[PDB]
Design an enzyme around this catalytic site. Structure first.
Site, short mmCIF file in Angstrom:
data_model
loop_
_atom_site.label_atom_id
_atom_site.label_comp_id
_atom_site.label_asym_id
_atom_site.label_seq_id
_atom_site.Cartn_x
_atom_site.Cartn_y
_atom_site.Cartn_z
N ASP A 402 0.74 -1.53 0.35
CA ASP A 402 0.23 0.07 0.22
C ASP A 402 0.38 1.57 -0.09
O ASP A 402 1.91 1.00 -0.08
CB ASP A 402 -1.19 0.19 0.71
CG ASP A 402 -0.34 -0.19 2.79
OD1 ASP A 402 0.89 -0.94 2.95
OD2 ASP A 402 -0.32 1.10 3.82
N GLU A 455 -0.69 -0.37 -4.76
CA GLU A 455 -1.35 0.72 -4.62
C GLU A 455 -1.11 1.89 -4.31
O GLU A 455 0.17 1.87 -3.58
CB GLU A 455 -2.30 0.20 -3.06
CG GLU A 455 -3.21 1.23 -3.43
CD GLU A 455 -3.03 3.03 -2.06
OE1 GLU A 455 -2.12 2.65 -0.66
OE2 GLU A 455 -2.07 3.79 -3.08
#
EC number: 2.4.1.18
Length: 722
Positions: A402, A455
């Site tokens: 992330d 991400e």
């Protein structure tokens, strides 16, 4: 004079700031007579045992003891410390043992290229066969270049001992020590005397086991677990996830079903996923983290699964069980987050060791925000080897990183006075880029068939592009644009949707610029954003219909899928890791059972229809039937598989049914209605086409054939040739 060390050395040894304990402690030969020293404060009697002669006893200084006495060679012996209230104990002398780490391993580490660094650093039980027999204990190794000293502390020292100093191995910065008879599963910490004079008790950066939070000590852990997933592992190496089915159930282990251990989850979570039809499970950070409220993103022990739910082997059993059930396992990996706890990784050796440093004391633009120093070989190695660690030691099938944007950019403040574009040193962190490329290339090389997912919130391109041509090397990336445009559109009342039709079909313009995963994760159902159910307009019946439509749309749209726990049954209230999921909804006389049933059905159709996942990354797997029916709020398109199969998807986002709707199709004949989200079994109103429609030879929408059918309000229809 060679009985008691010099004042300076003696002072360092007692203050715990000696860099080479083994130089003073142990056995040393001066001219002839072998002198033996032992450091054990608050001791009453030491005495050495040589062969069959207790010929020893020692007693000087402020904690130190010496044997002296003639004769040379010696070759192995044993000490027998004693204290008040307790009985003597014969133990082998740690400071007599040679370094338990080779020169080769240290060299690979210094270059930041050791692919199995976890076998070198940390705590590992070891056994050596000396003269008087075999001696067992634990070897310890920690990286701390600028520390003035590192001592081992634990239950045996009352967590404040000084008789266990470690030595640094040359200019490597790695401290080492072998402690005879240390517990196979004992707790411990490294007392570090920083380069800044500040002493700190640290958890082991390479801890493979840990004390249950809020406790912070590390625990020696060695595994011999026997895996039962050989078939899964051998099969995985022969597949390419990018071209396979991937329906992901995102799960937070601590709050899915509060109170479950790894062993219980190995049963319950596995069975749940199997019954819901997901091909993969994505777990929020499983590595040890001190605060549950961080959801796992603020990790402190990168090499150890959280002890909240059991032991590392217990975790292996969870992974093993999912694998035997045919479920792939993806874990959230957090290289972008840096531990801020004083007992963790910050200013480890008294200097900004692991974190990226910046200018000294002063004004200017120097702030905090701790991020790993990807430019440092050993730090990069710490992270790259950790990725490999989870993939090989825990059989994890994938890793999702992330906040990659926070890693790729050094950015801050919008300048004033400078109205000219200047490149040279862009906002791009070349070190982070090089790190992500190495991690990806190395992981995919060592464990073929695994997936790395990113991400990225910025316009960065080539995220899933091969490293050999400039890409970051990720297998896939989260389609954040699709998520934002899609959720914004479905949140609007049907009477206004026409105004945002272009917003809904905008993702298709770049849906093939990367290998995407369409996500509706945990981040979208917390902090006032409401749940997917909460975003839906209308009464309970219409909200439910809208949600079933959304999920069908996510599954049919090019790209893999990811759905956060609780959302598969339309959980109404925002996720709360402290309360757990709202399972009671499945006991109500509501629409939740109906939404969960729909997910099972789309997952079932999904897994068996290659048209929905074999050509996700190319335009060849997609074809618009009608991308321009904003007037009726209808979206229709075809999905094509690499096996020649096909599926027609028609979405009606209007709040009313459309009767006598003519839909252009590729072929004529009978088209079977494989999905109708308005079916009464899902608790829709039951409007449908009675199982199928007949496509005649009446061209339409630029298609050779067409069929007339009814589109249920707020629904999705999928059709396949009979």
């Amino acid at each position: 004079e060679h009985l008691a060390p010099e004042p300076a050395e003696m002072a360092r040894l007692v203050a715990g700031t000696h860099h080479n304990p083994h130089g003073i402690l142990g056995a040393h030969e001066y001219d002839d007579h072998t002198v033996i020293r032992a450091f054990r404060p608050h001791a009453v009697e030491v005495v050495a045992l040589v062969g069959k002669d207790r010929f020893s006893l020692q007693h000087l200084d402020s904690g130190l003891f010496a044997v002296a006495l003639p004769f040379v060679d010696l070759i192995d012996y044993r000490l027998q410390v004693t204290y008040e209230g307790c009985e003597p104990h014969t133990v082998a002398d740690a400071y007599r043992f040679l370094p338990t780490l080779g020169e080769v391993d240290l060299h690979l580490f210094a270059e930041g290229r050791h692919e199995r660094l976890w076998e070198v650093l940390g705590a590992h039980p070891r056994s050596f066969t000396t003269a008087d027999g075999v001696v067992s204990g634990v070897s310890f190794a920690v990286w701390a270049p600028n520390a003035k000293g590192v001592s081992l502390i634990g239950e045996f020292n009352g967590w404040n001992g000084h008789e266990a100093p470690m030595r640094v191995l040359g200019p490597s910065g790695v401290w080492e020590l072998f402690w005879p008879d240390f517990p196979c599963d004992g707790l411990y910490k490294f007392r570090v005397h920083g380069a800044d004079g500040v002493v700190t008790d640290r958890a082991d950066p390479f801890a493979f086991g840990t004390e249950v939070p809020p406790q912070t000590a590390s625990r020696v852990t060695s595994s011999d677990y026997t895996w039962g997933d050989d078939d899964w592992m051998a099969g995985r190496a022969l597949r390419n996830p990018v071209n396979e089915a991937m329906s992901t159930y995102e799960v937070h282990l601590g709050s899915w079903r509060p109170g479950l251990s790894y062993r219980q989850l190995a049963r319950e979570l596995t069975d749940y996923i199997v019954d819901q039809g997901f091909t993969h499970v994505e777990l929020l950070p499983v590595a040890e983290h001190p605060f549950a409220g961080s959801w796992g993103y603020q990790v402190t022990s990168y090499y150890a699964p959280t002890s909240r739910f059991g032991t590392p082997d217990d975790f292996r059993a969870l992974v093993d069980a999912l694998h035997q059930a045919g479920i792939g396992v993806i874990v959230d990996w957090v290289p972008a987050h840096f531990p801020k706890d004083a007992w963790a990784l910050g200013r480890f050796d008294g200097t900004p060791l692991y974190e990226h440093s910046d200018p000294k004391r002063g004004e200017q633009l120097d702030w905090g925000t701790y991020v790993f120093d990807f430019g440092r070989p050993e730090v990069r190695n710490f992270l790259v080897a950790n990725a490999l660690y989870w993939l090989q030691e825990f059989h994890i099938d994938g890793l999702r990183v992330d906040a990659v944007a926070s890693m790729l950019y050094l950015d801050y403040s919008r300048p004033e006075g400078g109205w000219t574009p200047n490149v040279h040193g862009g906002r791009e962190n070349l070190e982070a880029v090089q790190f992500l490329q190495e991690m990806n290339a190395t992981a995919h090389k060592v464990a073929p068939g695994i997936v790395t997912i990113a991400e990225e919130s910025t316009p960065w391109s080539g995220v899933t592009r091969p490293t050999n041509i400039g890409g970051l090397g990720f297998s896939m990336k989260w389609n954040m644009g699709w998520m934002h445009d899609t959720l914004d559109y479905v949140s609007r009342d049907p009477v206004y949707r026409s105004y945002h039709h272009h917003e809904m079909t905008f993702s298709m313009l770049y849906a093939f610029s990367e290998n995407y995963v369409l996500p509706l994760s945990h981040d979208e159902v917390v902090h006032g954003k409401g749940t997917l159910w909460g975003r839906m307009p209308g009464n309970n019946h219409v909200k439910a219909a809208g949600l079933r439509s959304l999920l069908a749309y996510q599954w049919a749209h090019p790209g893999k899928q990811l759905l956060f726990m609780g959302q598969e049954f339309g959980q109404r209230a925002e996720w709360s890791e402290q309360r757990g999921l709202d399972w009671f909804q499945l006991d109500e006389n509501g629409f939740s059972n109906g939404i969960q049933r729909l997910v099972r059905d789309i997952n079932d159709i999904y897994r068996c229809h290659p048209a929905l996942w074999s050509l996700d990354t190319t335009p060849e797997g997609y074809s618009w039937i009608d991308a321009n029916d904003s007037a009726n709020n209808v979206l229709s398109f075809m999905r094509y598989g690499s096996d020649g199969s096909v599926l027609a998807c028609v979405f009606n986002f209007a709040g009313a049914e459309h009767r006598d709707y003519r839909l252009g199709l590729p072929r004529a004949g009978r088209w079977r209605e494989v999905l109708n989200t308005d079916a009464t079994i899902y608790h829709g109103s039951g409007i449908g086409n009675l199982g199928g429609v007949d496509a005649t030879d009446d061209p339409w929408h630029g298609r050779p054939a067409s069929a007339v059918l009814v589109l249920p309000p707020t629904s999705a229809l999928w059709l396949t040739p009979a």
